[PDB]
Design a protein around this nucleic acid. Structure first.
Ligand SMILES: [Mg+2]
Ligand SMILES: [Mg+2]
Ligand SMILES: [Mg+2]
Ligand SMILES: [Mg+2]
Ligand SMILES: [Mg+2]
Ligand SMILES: [Mg+2]
Ligand SMILES: [Mg+2]
Ligand SMILES: [Mg+2]
Ligand SMILES: [Mg+2]
Ligand SMILES: [Mg+2]
Ligand SMILES: [Mg+2]
Ligand SMILES: [Mg+2]
Ligand SMILES: [Mg+2]
Ligand SMILES: [Mg+2]
Ligand SMILES: [Mg+2]
Ligand SMILES: [Mg+2]
Ligand SMILES: [Mg+2]
Ligand SMILES: [Mg+2]
Ligand SMILES: [Mg+2]
Ligand SMILES: [Mg+2]
Ligand SMILES: [Mg+2]
Ligand SMILES: [Mg+2]
Ligand SMILES: [Mg+2]
Ligand SMILES: [Mg+2]
Ligand SMILES: [Mg+2]
Ligand SMILES: [Mg+2]
Ligand SMILES: [Mg+2]
Ligand SMILES: [Mg+2]
Ligand SMILES: [Mg+2]
Ligand SMILES: [Mg+2]
Ligand SMILES: [Mg+2]
Ligand SMILES: [Mg+2]
Ligand SMILES: [Mg+2]
Ligand SMILES: [Mg+2]
Ligand SMILES: [Mg+2]
Ligand SMILES: [Mg+2]
Ligand SMILES: [Mg+2]
Lengths: 70, 116, 87, 101
RNA sequence: GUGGGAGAGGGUGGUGGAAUUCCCGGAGUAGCGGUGAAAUGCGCAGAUACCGGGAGGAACGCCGAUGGCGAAGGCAGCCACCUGGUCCACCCGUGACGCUGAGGCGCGAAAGCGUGGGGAGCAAACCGGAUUAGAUACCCGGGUAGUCCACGCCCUAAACGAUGCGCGCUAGGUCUCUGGGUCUCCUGGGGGCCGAAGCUAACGCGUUAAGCGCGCCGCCUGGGGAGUACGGCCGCAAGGC
């Protein structure tokens, strides 16, 4: 499988308002993807987590979703 | 007496029992069934045979009000959670979609000693 | 907090000469200012215990240098203490 | 004075009489708290990720200011007063950290 | 000093969603729950399951780690204010100002105590149901103190790296966090794994020493009796040194 950072551009990791890119880092559910799937580094994932939680409080990124399978 | 012909179905699967509710697109229920509704009484309620029969009893009850198209909602892990779904596709009800909405908390309440 | 503007104001007042950043008078001045920034932060927030530890080390370090100033040149010690109102 | 970013989401059902009033009330509160505004970005009608106040959307406002630091939480308390005002999030400004540069 | 840096470090206020419980309403019949099987329990005054609305308290899913911070205890939503520690680049300033540390003073999970609150979930004691030769238990249904908050006591622990602190010296390899750099790498400071010399009774340790040395504090001298008795200090008590 491809990874997120691999298939992307030059983006702002601290911008909580850009949802179109922050949508790519969420799974089917509202969960934050592990590092093995984002292709980020240690310092990068720590910022991504905090900026995703910000976008959640602004009603932009969902806390949880519903899996359509099984 | 309702003529709904479309709606949702909620499968509440536990280790001790599996129970089915059939509703309309708004969330209000029409009929339902469970492992105790059919003859099974004890631990036989949380068995896949029970989950299957419980599903098909509710499915025929929904035929009375005329259900044809059905959406599926599943909550909980337990024996027969899949036997209920497999029973639901071949129940005659055309199954529209199948969603797992099992509620998981963000670690808010302290569980009983059993779950730790 | 303590911005670099207020910082330079202290060094230039207590410098033994222009360009002096590390005199014993300069360090004790700098230390005392952080003492007073903390003593007013600990008047309120009396339950902030971990910050109470850093304060004890500064007082130790502040008295560490005065006990050194005493031994070498007691005049500048008195001129320093009288200027900061200590002890 | 430090630099901050203001995020305000309010009820996306207002006409122009109530929208201009809510916003000029926002401008009134920034004057009393001394927030020199540097620039503004207005998105408005945006699809929310979950129901907020039974409403599926929100009207978004963004201000960038430079104000005294001590009066921040007082300002946050001043904006949640209005009924139409729903979400108030204030963040200290930060540098645009780049990834995959 | 100057200029940068990372962080569940601390304190104060504020704030977000999931979930449990409870109330209101809509809708809807005959059971739910729970176990190795069951039964007390709850359900026709209508539960469980479903939808909507409301309230309250406590805890922070994913990120999340063999990870980070802190002197130890210990510290996870998010925002802001106050704030501590520490590390790197410059080679700028002072000129031995250092290390340890008997007392003293301050901190100190949980449990317990006081006054006043708060009380959703969990839960000693206890009320029941089972199991059993018996059940004063593991398993099940209920449930008070308490857990949470504010203020003041209590001073114990497997408080664990069962390794006191500081410094110097003594092959490397590899994984990692974070800085700087002429950025296959080099160079610091932490956090892991192998292992030279060497030590150790052996297991094992090995630039994070348990090696080689030096300084200072603490403490040990057979088991039971016994962390008991007496005395003293402390404590409201329980009890601690
Ligand atoms: Mg059963
Ligand atoms: Mg409001
Ligand atoms: Mg913190
Ligand atoms: Mg804190
Ligand atoms: Mg009701
Ligand atoms: Mg009865
Ligand atoms: Mg009854
Ligand atoms: Mg009755
Ligand atoms: Mg209540
Ligand atoms: Mg985890
Ligand atoms: Mg550490
Ligand atoms: Mg700091
Ligand atoms: Mg020099
Ligand atoms: Mg000289
Ligand atoms: Mg010392
Ligand atoms: Mg001592
Ligand atoms: Mg204590
Ligand atoms: Mg306690
Ligand atoms: Mg109490
Ligand atoms: Mg209970
Ligand atoms: Mg119990
Ligand atoms: Mg008996
Ligand atoms: Mg030794
Ligand atoms: Mg680099
Ligand atoms: Mg290292
Ligand atoms: Mg050998
Ligand atoms: Mg030995
Ligand atoms: Mg080893
Ligand atoms: Mg050594
Ligand atoms: Mg002894
Ligand atoms: Mg002897
Ligand atoms: Mg003896
Ligand atoms: Mg004892
Ligand atoms: Mg005696
Ligand atoms: Mg005694
Ligand atoms: Mg007494
Ligand atoms: Mg005792």
């Amino acid at each position: 499988k491809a990874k997120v950072k691999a298939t992307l551009g030059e983006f702002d990791l601290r911008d909580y308002r850009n949802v179109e890119v922050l949508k790519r880092f969420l799974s089917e559910t509202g969960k934050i993807l592990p590092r093995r799937r984002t292709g980020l580094s240690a310092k990068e994932q720590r910022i991504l987590a905090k900026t995703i939680k910000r976008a959640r409080i602004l009603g932009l990124l969902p806390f949880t979703e519903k899996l359509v399978r099984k | 007496k309702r003529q709904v012909a479309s709606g949702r179905a909620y499968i509440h699967a536990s280790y001790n029992n599996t129970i089915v509710t059939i509703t309309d697109p708004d969330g209000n229920p029409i009929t339902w069934s469970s492992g105790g509704v059919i003859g099974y009484k004890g631990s036989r309620k949380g068995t896949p045979y029970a989950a299957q029969l419980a599903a098909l009893d509710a499915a025929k009850k929904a035929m009375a009000y005329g259900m044809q198209s059905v959406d599926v909602i599943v909550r909980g892990t337990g024996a027969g959670r899949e036997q209920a779904i497999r029973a639901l596709q071949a129940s005659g009800l055309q199954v529209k979609s199948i969603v797992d909405d099992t509620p998981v908390p963000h670690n808010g309440c302290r569980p009983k000693k059993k779950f730790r | 907090p303590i911005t670099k503007e207020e910082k330079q104001k202290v060094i230039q007042e207590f410098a033994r000469f222009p360009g002096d950043t590390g005199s014993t008078e300069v360090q004790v001045a700098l230390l005392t200012l952080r003492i007073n920034r903390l003593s007013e932060h600990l008047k309120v927030h009396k339950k902030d215990h971990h910050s109470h530890r850093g304060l004890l080390m500064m007082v130790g370090q502040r008295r560490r240098l005065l006990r050194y100033l005493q031994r070498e040149d007691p005049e500048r010690y008195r001129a320093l203490i009288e200027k900061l109102g200590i002890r | 004075m430090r630099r901050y970013e203001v995020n305000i989401v309010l009820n996306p059902n207002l006409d122009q009489s109530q929208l201009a009033l809510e916003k000029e009330i926002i401008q009134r509160a920034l004057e009393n708290y001394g927030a020199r505004v540097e620039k503004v970005e207005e998105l408005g009608l945006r699809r929310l990720a979950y129901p907020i106040a039974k409403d599926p959307q929100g009207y978004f406002l963004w201000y960038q200011v430079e104000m005294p630091e001590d009066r921040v939480n007082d300002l946050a308390r001043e904006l949640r007063i209005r009924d139409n005002v729903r979400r108030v999030m204030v963040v200290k400004s930060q540098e645009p950290f780049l990834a995959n540069a």
